[PDB]
Swiss-Prot record, chain B:
The gene is IKI3. It comes from the Eukaryota. It is found in: Cytoplasm; Nucleus. Phosphorylation promotes the tRNA modification function of the elongator complex. It comes from Saccharomyces cerevisiae (strain ATCC 204508 / S288c) (Baker's yeast). Disruption phenotype: Loss of mcm5U (5-methoxycarbonylmethyl uridine) and ncm5U (5-carbamoylmethyl uridine) from tRNA. The chain holds residues 965 to 1157 of 1349 of the full protein. This is Elongator complex protein 1. Homodimer; dimerization promotes ELP1/IKI3 stability and elongator complex formation. Component of the elongator complex which consists of ELP1/IKI3, ELP2, ELP3, ELP4, ELP5/IKI1 and ELP6. The elongator complex is composed of two copies of the Elp123 subcomplex (composed of ELP1/IKI3, ELP2 and ELP3) and two copies of the Elp456 subcomplex (composed of ELP4, ELP5/IKI1 and ELP6). The Elp123 subcomplex forms a two-lobed scaffold, which binds the Elp456 subcomplex asymmetrically. In the complex, ELP1/IKI3 interacts with ELP2. In each lobe, ELP2 is tightly sandwiched between ELP1/IKI3 and ELP3. Belongs to the ELP1/IKA1 family. Component of the elongator complex which is required for multiple tRNA modifications, including mcm5U (5-methoxycarbonylmethyl uridine), mcm5s2U (5-methoxycarbonylmethyl-2-thiouridine), and ncm5U (5-carbamoylmethyl uridine). The elongator complex catalyzes formation of carboxymethyluridine in the wobble base at position 34 in tRNAs. Functions as a gamma-toxin target (TOT); disruption of the complex confers resistance to Kluyveromyces lactis toxin zymocin (pGKL1 killer toxin). May also be involved in sensitivity to Pichia inositovora toxin. Present with 10500 molecules/cell in log phase SD medium.
């Protein structure tokens, strides 16, 4: 027992070492690794510290104590951690380790391509003291990142164009059927492919679905036989849009849209400036123009994109009441700090 | 000429410029056009009209970069000088933009003589900017002072990478020098706040 050892033995610096060691063992047995990592080190043993840091994501201190204790396998540990970083999508840490611990920087440049940071990419390139290394590792990398971001923005442009429609059909494989009284129909991460209500999202998993509305399917008026909210009138002669759509589906789609746009915005402007610096002003113009087009498309539509949290129960009305809950529970967009040179 | 004057009298400046540019088919740009755009600040139409002629478009780039550097904003001036080169002016725009990495890369790739002076200017900026992270980075990598880098690490409430840097110089004394004093100061300031 540790509870009887943390009350009366609470201030025995030598006994408390073993008390904390056993507590850290128990907390590791509690499927936790961060507090276990910080708790594995009163005694003074650091190999256990690295072992816990593997699952505690505290890379730097693990490599530090490794090189202080066993500096022979530090490169191997670096590779082992780069594996996770590539899996865990933290490419910048792997790039920093590759350029600093490991020898090559070109692979760090490639990992920079996975994070859209061309300033540090060129910095660590010219760290090799050669301007041709630009066209060798970052200018191809910049072109590849340009292609990736351009295709992603094309996908988001298609998304905003489709959601503006009632049927959501402006891509190749998006379509929904009228008068289908259930089905979230968000089987894709970014709503790229959606099947009808009788096929799509019949599983119990609904990704990025609840974190966009302040309500649920619990009908307090026992309408729809307690089905998902806002599935009553799925006709195509509505005449308007907003809370007359599958309101939860619409707001979760547009919330994914705004999240992608906002997350890409720093990366998007980074790539835009990188393309501008490389004397290819035209693609910077094209990227910024597409970005501003999708932003302008979203600008006039959030005024109607709306969902009502806990007042919709087989509502006959299309938009429900005028506006009951504010525009915060529903997704909202932000301004865009455009440049001035691509115009 | 009559069309330019007509569009001037009504105040239709954009029409005036887009009809004055076409008076001469030469690759050498006119100076009336640059005088007009400088007087009216309509370079946007200059670059919306001369997407064809690269050299004259770069002339408009130059004048627009001058305008932006003068009035308010700076990364515009640097990214515009990127085409014209304008080495020293590009450096100035970059460092006034607090964009250390790009400017110092240009320095080390162009000027192997002023590499550290711009580093001094950037460290002064970051100390004034209170951005001790990049301050520490440019101190350790370019100013090559591990002690000052760790001091900025503690200033920016960073210790893990401070331990990294203390290990890097094979100097464990730094903990008793700055790192432990820095953590003590952090404890003091958190208690004070």
């Amino acid at each position: 027992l540790y509870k009887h050892g943390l009350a009366l033995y609470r201030y025995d610096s030598e006994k408390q070492n073993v008390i904390y060691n056993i507590y850290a063992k128990h907390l590791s047995s509690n499927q936790m690794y961060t507090d276990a990592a910080v708790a594995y080190e009163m005694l003074g043993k650091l190999k256990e510290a690295m072992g816990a840091y593997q699952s505690a994501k505290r890379w730097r201190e693990a490599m530090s104590i490794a090189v202080q204790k066993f500096p022979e396998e530090v490169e191997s540990v670096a590779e082992e951690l780069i594996s996770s970083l590539t899996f865990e999508h933290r490419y910048v840490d792997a790039a920093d380790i590759q350029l600093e611990y490991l020898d090559n920087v070109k692979e760090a440049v490639a990992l920079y391509c996975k994070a859209y940071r061309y300033d540090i990419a060129s910095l660590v390139a010219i760290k090799a003291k050669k301007d041709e290394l630009l066209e060798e590792v970052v200018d191809p990398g910049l072109g590849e990142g340009f292609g990736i971001i351009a295709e992603l923005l094309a996908d988001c442009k298609g998304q905003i164009n489709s959601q503006l429609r009632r049927l959501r059909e402006l891509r190749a494989k998006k379509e929904e059927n009228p008068y289908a009284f259930y089905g979230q129909e968000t089987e894709q991460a970014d709503d790229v492919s959606v099947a009808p209500s009788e096929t799509s999202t019949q599983e119990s998993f609904f990704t990025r679905y609840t974190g966009k509305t302040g309500g649920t399917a619990k009908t307090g008026a026992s309408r729809r036989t307690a089905k998902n909210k806002r599935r009553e009138e799925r006709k195509r002669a509505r005449g308007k849009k907003g809370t007359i759509y599958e309101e939860e589906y619409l707001v979760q789609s547009v919330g994914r849209l705004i999240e992608r746009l906002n997350q890409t915005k720093p990366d998007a402007v980074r790539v835009v400036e990188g393309l501008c610096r490389r004397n290819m002003r035209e693609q910077a113009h094209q990227i910024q123009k597409n970005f501003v087009e999708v932003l302008d498309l979203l600008k006039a539509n959030v005024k109607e994109i709306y969902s009502i949290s806990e007042k919709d129960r087989e509502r006959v009305n299309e938009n429900g009441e005028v506006y009951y809950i504010p525009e915060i529970p529903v997704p909202e967009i932000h301004d865009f700090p455009k440049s001035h040179i691509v115009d | 000429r009559r069309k330019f004057l007509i569009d001037d009298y009504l105040g239709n400046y954009e029409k005036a410029l887009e009809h004055l540019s076409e008076i001469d088919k030469d690759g050498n740009v006119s100076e009336e056009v640059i005088d007009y755009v400088e007087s009216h600040d309509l370079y946007k139409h200059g670059l919306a009209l001369y997407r064809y002629d690269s050299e004259k478009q770069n002339v408009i780039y130059n004048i627009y970069a001058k305008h932006l550097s003068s009035n308010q904003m700076y990364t515009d001036a640097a990214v515009a000088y990127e085409m014209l080169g304008k080495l020293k002016e590009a450096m100035g725009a970059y460092q006034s933009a607090k964009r250390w990495r790009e400017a110092m890369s240009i320095a080390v790739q162009k000027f192997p003589e002023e590499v550290e002076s711009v580093a001094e200017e950037l460290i002064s900026s970051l100390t004034f900017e209170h951005r001790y992270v990049d301050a520490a980075d440019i101190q350790l990598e370019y100013l090559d002072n591990v002690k000052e880098a760790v001091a900025l690490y503690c200033k920016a409430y960073r210790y893990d990478i401070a331990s990294l840097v203390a290990i890097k110089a094979k100097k464990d004394e730094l903990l008793e020098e700055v790192v432990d004093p820095g953590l003590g100061e952090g404890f003091g300031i958190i208690a004070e706040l």
